[PDB]
Assembly symmetry: D4
């Protein structure tokens, strides 16, 4: 029972590793002509849509650092397990960024698709955008998993896939698509470049927390015990 | 039981707010090259597809003003509850349009994607187009929710997502994509500009009403009591 | 019971009318720049994907003339009911083509997206292409509806949507996308132009028949009575 | 019972034949302008998504040679049945490549979309890319079919469709999209051209095997008997 | 002295032959993506700019049938010599169209760039456009050659090159670029297709005549003898 | 001698009429894909380059209202003759705009290419841009005509053509290309729309005057009599 | 006097070296989106236009191997001097191709823009195209230099620039632009690849010879002594 | 005579100011779609082509810092006059960069078109490219002005215009177009950013010096006195 908890860490490590490799790989600058924004955005989404199928089955499939905290603040996971996914995700993000670098040609690779802030957009406007991107994403994942609802949501994994597709397509223009610290983290480190890299952690975390609370405190509450459930933290 | 009815108003307010923010945000003029019509259209659809998952679960997820009336004329909702969603939607539409404005750069924003009538297209042709766009959309949402059918419709929420994708892609060319008063409403007000803005209310409302009746009076009727069901209006 | 059979004819009439209006409308020549082939193809698919949800529930949702015959040759429908859908579809196709014409500007409309044979492609090569396009489409729809399989096919209606997306995207290049007589029929008549218009009827019909037999005589047979089932023709 | 096993070989032959015809047909060089990478990639995916619906129902629907071995190494199939699918797939791949050739015009066809290695990319980098492309694809198909999980995966067939869409979109740039020996095989033979054609067999096979083991030995094991199950090989 | 007159006929035959081969060759349908209108237009211009250098030196370099008449009505050439250039030009146009056909692939060639009238544009609007296109072209060539002006016009041959570039770029949209009967003539005959082909002869001839008179009767007259000069017709 | 002065007015009327017809005609909205800015810009230039050849020979060839004043302030023309060209130009501009309207289809024509101010650009920034555009244009035309310099300027008319090409290409982005009141004037009147239309008169006039003085008072002065030359105003 | 002849060899060596470096450098594969054919074609032309100014002044400026022979067959140069330019050109072509290789990134460079024969085009059709491309080019250069004509040809060097622009733009599609053995030679050798490389030598040489004779034996002969002039060969 | 020397400094100041304003202004990031490389490159060329007409007449028109030194090393100018142009050019470059900044919107402006080194290209490869770009440019300007040659070079100013067009088009890809310190200087200072900014000074200066010597010591020497001419330095 103890070791089984560890496999989930692998699912999260491999899932994120693949997530960063395919999507960040999709960004690679070789589009000067068509607006690859349709492509890159579409790539992150299909990457996430599929990972959810292989990974989520085993355990979670969060992949996104900001999204994991959403579940923790969501009150339904151990504080340690939360920390386990974040480190598995960051390392997973870099493991992927590391390989993508080795495989793509010099002229092809630039900063490995480093989240570049849009000329006109200011730092404050960039944060709010990140706030809303994750809020919708988290709100989508939260409902999708919500057992309470049997209904006919259909491909719950595919549902999440498109939800992310929306965030990136839009996010791509304002803040070079973010809504995920892992995504922003790998390019900066694997290419010694840290600038506004914090707005990316700040918006998604606030967004995730905000988006998480919105589903609970309001939208679709847990008709049981709020104070009692918060015991998961103690194990 | 009384207050619970109010949360649904929030679901509709937040859903529409997000709906207008992401899709209208997608339109922003920065495509002069590729035909963003594929993008913008695709954006409104994924935005709607996802909102249906988070919002619909709690209550409705109509988002579209013309679509809400379809349900009311559809005979299965209180007249007051209908009015509650429309105001929640319009305000939600503006709340989103308001934020999108603050975040996008000056050169980027124009009229915040104001539904501009296509050069050649006349006002009459623009209305019929709006009539058909909503009719198909309403007809799709109506069937999707129709409990009667168990079958294997699959991701009912995703189904609605693509249905709207079709309306906008086509709508984008003739009347700068409409089929939703809320979508048309936010840009006009948040950018003091009212022109043909009525064709947008006129076509979608007629379309919604027409599309709603088509599913009932004909297609797939309610094998119970038509006169008896109309009692929901009285509560 | 007698009149109820007639409503199905309406579902097929409205479904096709909408099918031709949205997809053929999507083709309209105003893309000289991006390769609208991605768009037009994508449009026919979403149009079909959605119609299946509203229409199929009530009855069939074939929409495609060649596809209806597939079911008839498929041995599971009355010969008269088959004829009823074809005429409902052709008229539905024209009803849509008629309205699309009235609404689109002169410069916009050309031949209303008349299936133009590709310069190099010969008449024989154009037929085989049509043969394969419908075969896959019919084979997809046949399995989708096959009750025998409970499984987890998921959104059966959405499944059909993409299947058609494939046919049109490919079909668009060789024979200006066909695989549907109704689609080919409306532009030719609503714009007095008949040329190779037969290859379109010939390939899809052969394809549909061929594709239909493949699923039965081989692939997934009906483990019951082949000779007995053929009694549906007599009613 | 003996002959029934043979029909599965047909499902695999027809499925692959169609798979190569539609996707490879989509690649045909006539895009010099838009970045058909979005198209071609999208085509292979919808082609696979749909085949899974018609073919998988009858038996398997692997289509991909490297993917079939994944199931064999996956320990749950007869060694002979595995060999039966590979030959049915290769022949099916060529049967399709053969027809595509006859139908497309001379100027249109080049090498029938022969997997051309990207200028800068070296042979070693091309292999690793192929390794990761198939690993994710196999891992996706493996989970999708995994009975153990009832859940709400939704359209299991559509899920696989997008998963492949990701591999090709990315694969298209580095190694002209591979992740499938059959896809790489048809163009080389139907156009006497063999170069680096081995990297394609090498990466997908390693990837498939690697991806297969990852799901078992780790991720989601078979809580029964590993040594006992390996008896399927003996029949 | 008699035979020398004949060489001029060759200069005109070869000049036009090359003119139609390069420009019409430039039109060939293989641009679906970028707007080759910039290309095709640019091609006709450089083709004309250069021919003027090799051909004009020997004799004339009119190339354009409508332009030759401009000089004849311009009062400064024998009526027979005028007829000699027209037949040399038409044959030259076809000689070029004939070879272009033999060399370009089947899929490439369509109607050999047959002047296709623009969907919306009516026959009357198409004529006026042709009227203005040639008027400016003729007016440009007339001044360029006008000995009277020594000045510093510079590359008189290059001047004419761009003047034509303007006509075609604009002409390309309304009437698939015309302003030259020879250009319109070759595709129609070398591809049995005659439709509105007369508007092309009608507009350029009227335009040429009109443009010719404008330079004389008004703009820059011949300060000598108008009635006396008209004796060139008699030899 | 008196009537001869009048022909110059015709040269200016026809020149401008053609100038507005070809260039404004080039702008017509049908580019959504490629960046017609290269085209439209290129069109105005070739249009001007050629007019200079036919028109300038007879008299002036200013075409641009702001440019005519440059010559008047340039001290070398009668005040009345200056007024004669401006009215001939404005009427000429409209005469052209009038015909362009009648010939282009409804869907094609919008505002007849009305100088639309760029979203972000403010009114003040739009004026300075106009100031610099005309200054360079005037400075170029001034030198070109400057008899004093024999040298080898080459095609003086072609030189002016490209100079204008630069102004429009750049001008097109900030203020929808202006640098010419006539160009800005025709669309506004022929399509009842006056907005910021003054910035266009203000910048080019200031620019022209400023650019004119720069060549005289500084750059290349008139080594004769400044006070004496100013007598041309008195005739 | 003896050594001075040698400097001309340098002018030809440097001219060609630069010619191949800039134009072939322009081809480099990084355009997948816009149709760089406009670019690449335009590049070879400006490269040639300018070289003619620096190089031609000193001696010749042929640059093109096939073009040099045109002058030799043109009867006006020593047989040895002809051989001197060809070797200076080939070496110059490689010297340039060598440096371009060292400077461009791996992923960027492919075959260094190796003249790739167009899919559909056959070897015979590829030769005729090359025949006509050089004929017009040679005919243009021949007239340009022809002292006999004083006239107002204008920028003789610029005239040649555009003439070549035409050949390459057209040539680019059929035979990946050739009309110059040097251009075809450098990529093949600097990238061990020889295929159809002969059609390139065959067409341009035939074309050059043919084009050369056309200007003499016919067009604009040398009204002096044909047999006497052929003495230049003897010195 | 003393003050007259100063006006030349103004011609150089205004010329460069305009040069940087128009060309750098052309670069502004708003092309993501078409390959503005054709545009930006074309802009710098027309900007230079025209300035040469207004400025060169008065004095020089060098505009390019590296080009001025070419003339100084070219032995035909005072050492002080050389220094006067460089400072007039740098200040002129900034004066232009300063205004361009104030006028373009925030979102539009980025780094004001700061010469960004191409991902793959290394610092050494970037220098050689700069070396060759200026060498050809200087060699072109040198010949153009060379009095010795009367001939028919034509529009000497236009000749220089295209020569630069070539350098920038090519230069744009490798080192974001340089070949001019002034061009590279303005963006770095007006946007506190200095990186590899030296390679730009290093390559153009070496190139200019090298290109200058090539025309003298070899190509077309000065058949007079080399040691005597070097006296200009002393005045």
């Amino acid at each position: 029972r103890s070791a089984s908890f560890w496999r989930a860490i692998f699912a999260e490590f491999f899932a994120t590793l693949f997530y960063v490799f395919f999507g960040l790989g999709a960004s690679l600058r070789w589009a000067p002509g068509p607006l690859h924004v349709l492509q890159v955005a579409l790539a992150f989404g299909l990457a996430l849509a599929t990972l959810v199928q292989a990974v989520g089955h085993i355990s979670g499939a969060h992949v996104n650092p900001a999204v994991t905290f959403a579940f923790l603040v969501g009150s339904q996971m151990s504080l340690l397990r939360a920390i386990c996914y974040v480190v598995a995700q960051l390392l997973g993000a870099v493991a992927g960024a590391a390989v993508l670098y080795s495989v793509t040609p010099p002229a092809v690779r630039g900063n490995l698709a480093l989240n570049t802030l849009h000329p006109g957009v200011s730092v404050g406007q960039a944060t709010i955008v990140e706030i809303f991107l994750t809020l919708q994403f988290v709100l989508c994942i939260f409902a999708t998993y919500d057992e309470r609802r049997n209904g006919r949501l259909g491909s719950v994994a595919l549902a999440v896939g498109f939800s992310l597709t929306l965030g990136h397509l839009f996010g791509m223009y304002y803040t070079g698509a973010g809504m995920n610290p892992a995504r922003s983290f790998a390019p900066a480190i694997l290419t010694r470049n840290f600038t506004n890299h914090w707005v990316y952690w700040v918006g998604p975390v606030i967004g995730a927390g905000l988006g998480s609370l919105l589903y609970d405190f309001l939208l679709f509450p847990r008709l049981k015990s709020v104070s009692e459930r918060l015991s998961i933290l103690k194990g």
